[PDB]
């Protein structure tokens, strides 16, 4: 018995087009259909410079924007050998972590709105509209902040942003507590989530989950502890790791990972060195407006970096960061030219949404939206 | 194993005046009355809402909204036709054609940003050498018809003169970065 389970609530899971082969109410197999959001991203990037390539990444995962620009930047610094300053690293993490918070605040309470709890959605989205007052203030666009450029980061924080991020972090433990007091204790929540989509660790490894769905099963594997790719080796934070694997562990993790991300934000705030914002290598970082206008040699680079590009040397690397969805890695083959060459984007949600087939076997049809909830399936990456 | 796991996870809470605690917190729905109480606290608290048309959400001088071609204080469009923004544009929205005007100084005969084919990433504002193209904080230009949304060659992007009073302010405050 085949059922074309589509997007239950649009605007939350946009193009979800599962084709469930059911058995009464018990689902026997879930066959997701991809491509409804397949923009030509892995082709369009081959046609544009390494700078023009960056805006696609904030548009790859639309609920955790800067994590993908941070995964791309670290793939055009893996090749460029472009050492970025300490302040660029600290800002880059303070925003990758603000993005982890922006994602878990959505991927928890959009999940909690698919399950049925209507209010956590709107509380978490007031919180997200506080964090977009930081995105929009530091770069310009509330969602797609093309801000974490290859060398360092686009431009320094405004002169009042750390004070505001602090005044937000002080009041954010309470918001997590409310999102938690409203959902963690509920017997209507546990019942809707405990023993739902349980993934034994061998399955989370096999299906390349590598995210909050690889730390549910108990595999202690965070690419901020495994492969520290910034000040992360300096910052202190504990990676919460589940013990059962059910969608109630992944929720409890995403609601603790939203507190450890608060620890990382507070650290990045309390220790942010007053250094240069971009790599001093002005052939990888366009010089400031003031310098390119006054200096002829800076003007030449501002011209050959906003038209030509880097021309990062010939290589091929797989740089993977811990994006909120999971291990978002961008395999970036680079022909010597200024344009990338098959900038393949390993995006979790392409490996997670595979897991829907075995996660939601023998679960009731109303659980198939809870699974899609805890996978944090955002179809931009799929 | 799940059978033994159940037996043990239920033999953990197996001492009187603990079975009673759990029974009175699953019968007098007590986890749920802490949900209702929080929900009430938020029912009575002030509302984080904004009656939009009259007051609008906070922005920043770096905010990227409607593209505006700036002008030099003494008229003279700031847009010398280098085509750097036409080059840097990721979506290739800007189409620039250049002609030595009769005065002799280069200028763009055609400077058409296609707003629909535009990602509002501010690359044009960065790439332009003289700050000729900047994004005005407008962001309120929803058009009834698509053809209007294609911003014509240097005529509608020349409406930035109205927004110059705010664009000059944002630039005077952002240029420090």
């Amino acid at each position: 018995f085949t059922l074309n389970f589509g997007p239950q609530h649009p605007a939350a899971h946009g193009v979800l087009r599962l084709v469930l082969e059911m058995n009464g109410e018990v689902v026997e197999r879930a066959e997701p259909h991809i491509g409804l959001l397949h923009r030509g991203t892995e082709k369009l990037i081959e046609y544009k410079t390494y700078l023009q390539a960056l805006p696609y990444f904030d548009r790859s995962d639309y609920v955790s924007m800067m994590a993908q620009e941070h995964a791309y930047s670290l793939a055009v610094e893996k090749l460029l050998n472009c050492e970025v300053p300490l302040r660029a690293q600290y800002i880059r993490v303070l925003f990758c972590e603000i993005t982890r918070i922006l994602n878990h605040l959505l991927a928890l309470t959009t999940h909690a709105m698919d399950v049925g709890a209507l209010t956590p959605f709107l509380w978490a989205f007031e919180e997200r509209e506080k964090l977009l007052e930081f995105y929009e203030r530091v770069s310009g666009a509330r969602m797609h902040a093309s801000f974490i450029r290859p060398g360092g980061v686009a431009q320094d924080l405004p002169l009042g942003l750390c004070r505001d991020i602090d005044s937000f972090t002080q009041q954010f433990a309470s918001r997590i507590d409310e999102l938690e007091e409203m959902l963690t204790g509920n017997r209507i929540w546990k019942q809707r989530l405990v023993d739902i989509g349980t993934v034994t660790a061998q399955q989370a490894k096999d299906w390349g989950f590598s995210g909050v769905m690889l730390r549910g099963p108990g595999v202690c594997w965070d690419l901020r502890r495994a492969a520290p790719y910034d000040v992360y080796d300096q910052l202190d934070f504990d990676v919460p790791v589940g013990t059962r694997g059910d969608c109630y562990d992944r929720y409890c993790i995403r609601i603790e990972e939203m507190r450890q991300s608060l620890r990382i934000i507070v650290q990045c705030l309390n220790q942010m060195p007053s250094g240069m914002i971009k790599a001093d290598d002005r052939k990888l970082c366009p010089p400031s407006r003031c310098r390119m206008k006054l200096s002829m040699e800076s003007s030449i680079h501002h011209f050959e970096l906003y038209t030509e590009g880097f021309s990062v040397p010939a290589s091929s690397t797989y740089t993977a960061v811990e994006a909120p969805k999971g291990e978002f890695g961008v395999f970036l083959v680079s022909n010597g030219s200024n344009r990338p060459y098959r900038c393949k984007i390993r995006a979790p949600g392409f490996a997670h949404l595979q897991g829907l087939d075995f996660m939601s076997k023998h679960h009731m049809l109303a659980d198939v939206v809870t699974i899609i909830g805890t996978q944090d399936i955002v179809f931009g990456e799929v | 194993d799940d059978e033994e796991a159940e037996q043990l996870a239920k033999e953990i809470s197996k001492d009187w005046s603990t079975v009673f605690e759990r029974s009175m917190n699953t019968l007098f729905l007590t986890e749920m009355v802490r949900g209702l109480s929080l929900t009430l606290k938020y029912f009575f608290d002030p509302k984080v809402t904004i009656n939009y048309p009259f007051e609008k959400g906070p922005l920043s001088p770096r905010f990227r909204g409607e593209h505006a071609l700036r002008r030099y204080p003494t008229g003279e469009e700031r847009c010398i036709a280098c085509k750097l923004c036409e080059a840097v544009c990721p979506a290739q929205a800007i189409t620039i054609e250049a002609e030595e005007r009769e005065d002799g100084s280069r200028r763009t005969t055609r400077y058409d940003i296609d707003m629909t084919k535009c990602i509002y990433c501010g690359f044009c504002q960065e790439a332009c050498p003289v700050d000729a193209i900047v994004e005005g904080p407008n962001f309120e230009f929803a058009t009834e018809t698509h053809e209007e949304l294609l911003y014509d060659k240097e005529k509608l992007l020349e409406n930035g003169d109205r927004w110059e009073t705010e664009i000059a302010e944002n630039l005077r405050s952002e240029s420090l970065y």
Binding site: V26, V194, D195, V241, T243, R244 | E6, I12
Partner: peptide, 24 residues
């Protein structure tokens, strides 16, 4: 249907961090 029902019993909540709390 003999499908495995979602048993809503489990072990009690105990926040499980990683071993790198104090000294890696």
């Amino acid at each position: 249907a003999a499908a495995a029902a979602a048993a809503a019993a489990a072990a009690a909540a105990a926040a499980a961090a990683a071993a790198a709390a104090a000294a890696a």
